From a paper:
Despite this distance, we found a water molecule to coordinate T335 with H319 via hydrogen bonding, an unusual mechanism that may serve to orient H319 for catalysis, thereby adopting the function of the third catalytic residue. To test whether such an unusual catalytic architecture is possible, we introduced a T335V mutation to disrupt this water bridge, which resulted in a substantial loss of activity. As T335 serves a catalytic function to correctly position H319 for catalysis, we wondered if mutating T335 to a negatively charged residue would enhance the activity of MINDY1. To our surprise, the mutation of T335 to aspartate also abolishes MINDY1 activity. To understand the reason underlying this loss of activity, we determined the crystal structure of MINDY1T335D, which revealed the formation of an ionic interaction between T335D and the catalytic H319. H319 is locked in this conformation, which is further rigidified by the network of hydrogen bonds with Q131, S321, and N134, resulting in the catalytic Cys being rotated away from H319. Hence, the mutation T335D also forces the enzyme into an unproductive catalytic state, thus highlighting the requirement of a water molecule to bridge an interaction with T335 via hydrogen bonding to correctly position H319.
Residue numbers in the entry: 110 to 181, 185 to 369
The structure:
Amino acid sequence: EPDFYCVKWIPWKGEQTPIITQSTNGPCPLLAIMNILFLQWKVKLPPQKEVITSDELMAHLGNCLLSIKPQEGLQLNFQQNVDDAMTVLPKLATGLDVNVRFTGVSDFEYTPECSVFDLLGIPLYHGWLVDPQSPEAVRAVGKLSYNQLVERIITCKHSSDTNLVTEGLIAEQFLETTAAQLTYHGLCELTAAAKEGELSVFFRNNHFSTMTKHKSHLYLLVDDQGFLQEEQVVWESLHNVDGDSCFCDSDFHLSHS
């Protein structure tokens, strides 16, 4: 029934902290969330441990969510947020559709999976922002979600009115041209947004990655099983829109294979 993953043991806050690794590059965000908790020393693993099941990671997470004492804001809601988190807890192992909005980097269509993040105080961000410098598209896309833009693009193909068939393409364009779901305007907004040395989760091309700002740059944790052995390789810059990027030790210093 369950999947296995290997554990990179790295020195974090000068203490031998575990992290979870995956070559598969799967869409499920269990590892993205979990890695954060491990870093935050909320979940501790026996030094010796080499491998971990989903069923373990899950149970560790369950305990964590149920262990959250409230702290005032949503009060009836908090209890529903827990029950919501708890009910969609299994869907985390599997994989998760994500309807992004293009309206800003913390903007998604709510699914009850969002409740897990909200509870653990983990921000979720995406890179796919429409550029106000293309007001043609800004207007065409408007305050609309991704899976919604597709519905409407299709609606617009078949529409008689050629005001729509024009916008139907004005949008078909914006997606044709932003295929890697991280526009420049995205990166800028996303960097500015994310708090200095705060652990967040970064969504893009149906993968979840663990994020932080550090000395006003964005780095992502190095989940790639590929560098299992390499204690020195932990953060990979998200400095460029696409291309090349420098690896670093847990202190955000350069490191080489």
